[PDB]
Amino acid sequence: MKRSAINDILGHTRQFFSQHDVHLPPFASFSPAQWQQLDTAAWEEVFDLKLGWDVTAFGRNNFAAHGLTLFTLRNGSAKGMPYVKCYAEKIMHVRDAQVTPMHFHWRKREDIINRGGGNLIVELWNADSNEQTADSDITVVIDGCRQKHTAGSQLRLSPGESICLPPGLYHSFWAEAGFGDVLVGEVSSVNDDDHDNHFLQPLDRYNLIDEDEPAQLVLCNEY
Amino acid sequence: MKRSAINDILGHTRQFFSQHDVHLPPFASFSPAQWQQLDTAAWEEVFDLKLGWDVTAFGRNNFAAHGLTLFTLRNGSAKGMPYVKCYAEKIMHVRDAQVTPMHFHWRKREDIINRGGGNLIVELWNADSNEQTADSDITVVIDGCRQKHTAGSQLRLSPGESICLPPGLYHSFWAEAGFGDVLVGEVSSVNDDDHDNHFLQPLLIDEDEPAQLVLCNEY
Ligand SMILES: [Mn+2]
Ligand SMILES: [Mn+2]
């Protein structure tokens, strides 16, 4: 990905958040110059836990078709030390028809929430012992309502609805085509994108960056 | 507390949420009649973990001066079983100058978040061995920025800002007088209001009209 594209994507996502009355912490708007002037001793948590902006095309070449934009608001340490917090939160922008590829988490349990906008479609499979998709029925809880569904079921989350995805459950999601961008919330146990994602297809969680213009903001993986 | 007052409070809070583009799950709007027709097997998590609406005047007679309106969106079991989820979330409405009295949690660690509206003022004290306020410096992290402050400091959270409150840290909060109502988020470890709250000053519904909604303590 080009830095110019990242600058553009983040500008648009910040506007989308503002449109939904979403407010981010002050550090969400820091320029690289402002980051350079901070007391690094007071800000270790942001750096250590990779709080902040995340833009990915999942190692591929078409962000619009496969990609995601996220802001990690709070987190704890993957091991539990030195940041003892068990929980994490993200706020995400899923663009119309934009797909987050099929994956499960080894450890993280997450509630994926449609905070507003379009409709979030979530496709679900159990993983078999070969780490492939299983033919077995899935059991999930959608806003406290427990239910069983066929393997590969595609569930629609309207604004306000959320689903709890236990570790090991394969999931892919997208904003239903035509119904608009979706504001997605994530409230979960600790997030570790370095090690806790298993994609069905072997892919990279982050993209390498072509530095074609000055960065307006700093990504959480480049502190 | 009169049911008419609760109906009005929840009506106003739902409007406030809508004005802030906050969207709640379908169960947030269930009438008592609708709750009666639910499959009790499929919905046990809502009942068991007390998800949903909460309106409190903190046992007193002045909601406007001391009160809070909350919706618990997700939760887990206090002791980790049978609901293993370790996290919880609430969305709350703090009315202008409305105070939540000084309290700490024995177990819950929470991030209190100004999701929008006015400014949230949070007053903080360490707890002593005798469950009184200590005069020791407080160490808190505001949006990943670690800082130390004097005992009893009143810290301002503007929209977007959040503070992590570890267990045992006394806290009281209110919407800064004149800056408007505040939409408050809480993302935390498991919530247990039955046992996990200690108020510094230790803490019935009159059905005068039909209930429009059901509160989380009356399942
Ligand atoms: Mn996931
Ligand atoms: Mn509290």
UniProtKB/TrEMBL annotation, chain A:
<feature type="binding site">
    <location>
        <position position="103"/>
    </location>
    <ligand>
        <name>Mn(2+)</name>
    </ligand>
</feature>
<feature type="binding site">
    <location>
        <position position="90"/>
    </location>
    <ligand>
        <name>beta-D-fructose 2</name>
    </ligand>
</feature>
<dbReference type="InterPro" id="IPR014710">
    <property type="entry name" value="RmlC-like_jellyroll"/>
</dbReference>
<feature type="binding site">
    <location>
        <position position="193"/>
    </location>
    <ligand>
        <name>beta-D-fructose 1</name>
    </ligand>
</feature>
<feature type="binding site">
    <location>
        <position position="90"/>
    </location>
    <ligand>
        <name>beta-D-fructose 1</name>
    </ligand>
</feature>
<feature type="binding site">
    <location>
        <position position="105"/>
    </location>
    <ligand>
        <name>beta-D-fructose 2</name>
    </ligand>
</feature>
<dbReference type="Pfam" id="PF07385">
    <property type="entry name" value="Lyx_isomer"/>
</dbReference>
<dbReference type="GO" id="GO:0047828">
    <property type="term" value="F:D-lyxose ketol-isomerase activity"/>
</dbReference>
<feature type="binding site">
    <location>
        <position position="186"/>
    </location>
    <ligand>
        <name>beta-D-fructose 2</name>
    </ligand>
</feature>
<dbReference type="GO" id="GO:0046872">
    <property type="term" value="F:metal ion binding"/>
</dbReference>
<feature type="binding site">
    <location>
        <position position="105"/>
    </location>
    <ligand>
        <name>Mn(2+)</name>
    </ligand>
</feature>
<feature type="binding site">
    <location>
        <position position="110"/>
    </location>
    <ligand>
        <name>Mn(2+)</name>
    </ligand>
</feature>
<keyword id="KW-0479">Metal-binding</keyword>
<protein>
    <recommendedName>
        <fullName>D-lyxose ketol-isomerase</fullName>
        <ecNumber>5.3.1.15</ecNumber>
    </recommendedName>
</protein>
<feature type="binding site">
    <location>
        <position position="108"/>
    </location>
    <ligand>
        <name>beta-D-fructose 1</name>
    </ligand>
</feature>
<dbReference type="InterPro" id="IPR011051">
    <property type="entry name" value="RmlC_Cupin_sf"/>
</dbReference>
<feature type="binding site">
    <location>
        <position position="171"/>
    </location>
    <ligand>
        <name>Mn(2+)</name>
    </ligand>
</feature>
<keyword id="KW-0464">Manganese</keyword>
<feature type="binding site">
    <location>
        <position position="186"/>
    </location>
    <ligand>
        <name>beta-D-fructose 1</name>
    </ligand>
</feature>
<comment type="similarity">
    <text>Belongs to the D-lyxose ketol-isomerase family.</text>
</comment>
<dbReference type="InterPro" id="IPR010864">
    <property type="entry name" value="D-lyxose_isomer"/>
</dbReference>
<keyword id="KW-0119">Carbohydrate metabolism</keyword>
UniProtKB/TrEMBL annotation, chain B:
<dbReference type="InterPro" id="IPR014710">
    <property type="entry name" value="RmlC-like_jellyroll"/>
</dbReference>
<keyword id="KW-0464">Manganese</keyword>
<dbReference type="Pfam" id="PF07385">
    <property type="entry name" value="Lyx_isomer"/>
</dbReference>
<feature type="binding site">
    <location>
        <position position="105"/>
    </location>
    <ligand>
        <name>beta-D-fructose 2</name>
    </ligand>
</feature>
<feature type="binding site">
    <location>
        <position position="110"/>
    </location>
    <ligand>
        <name>Mn(2+)</name>
    </ligand>
</feature>
<feature type="binding site">
    <location>
        <position position="108"/>
    </location>
    <ligand>
        <name>beta-D-fructose 1</name>
    </ligand>
</feature>
<feature type="binding site">
    <location>
        <position position="90"/>
    </location>
    <ligand>
        <name>beta-D-fructose 1</name>
    </ligand>
</feature>
<dbReference type="GO" id="GO:0047828">
    <property type="term" value="F:D-lyxose ketol-isomerase activity"/>
</dbReference>
<keyword id="KW-0479">Metal-binding</keyword>
<keyword id="KW-0119">Carbohydrate metabolism</keyword>
<feature type="binding site">
    <location>
        <position position="108"/>
    </location>
    <ligand>
        <name>beta-D-fructose 2</name>
    </ligand>
</feature>
<feature type="binding site">
    <location>
        <position position="110"/>
    </location>
    <ligand>
        <name>beta-D-fructose 1</name>
    </ligand>
</feature>
<protein>
    <recommendedName>
        <fullName>D-lyxose ketol-isomerase</fullName>
        <ecNumber>5.3.1.15</ecNumber>
    </recommendedName>
</protein>
<dbReference type="InterPro" id="IPR010864">
    <property type="entry name" value="D-lyxose_isomer"/>
</dbReference>
<feature type="binding site">
    <location>
        <position position="186"/>
    </location>
    <ligand>
        <name>beta-D-fructose 2</name>
    </ligand>
</feature>
<dbReference type="GO" id="GO:0046872">
    <property type="term" value="F:metal ion binding"/>
</dbReference>
<feature type="binding site">
    <location>
        <position position="105"/>
    </location>
    <ligand>
        <name>Mn(2+)</name>
    </ligand>
</feature>
<dbReference type="InterPro" id="IPR047581">
    <property type="entry name" value="EcSI_cupin"/>
</dbReference>
<keyword id="KW-0413">Isomerase</keyword>
<feature type="binding site">
    <location>
        <position position="193"/>
    </location>
    <ligand>
        <name>beta-D-fructose 1</name>
    </ligand>
</feature>
<feature type="binding site">
    <location>
        <position position="90"/>
    </location>
    <ligand>
        <name>beta-D-fructose 2</name>
    </ligand>
</feature>
<feature type="binding site">
    <location>
        <position position="186"/>
    </location>
    <ligand>
        <name>beta-D-fructose 1</name>
    </ligand>
</feature>
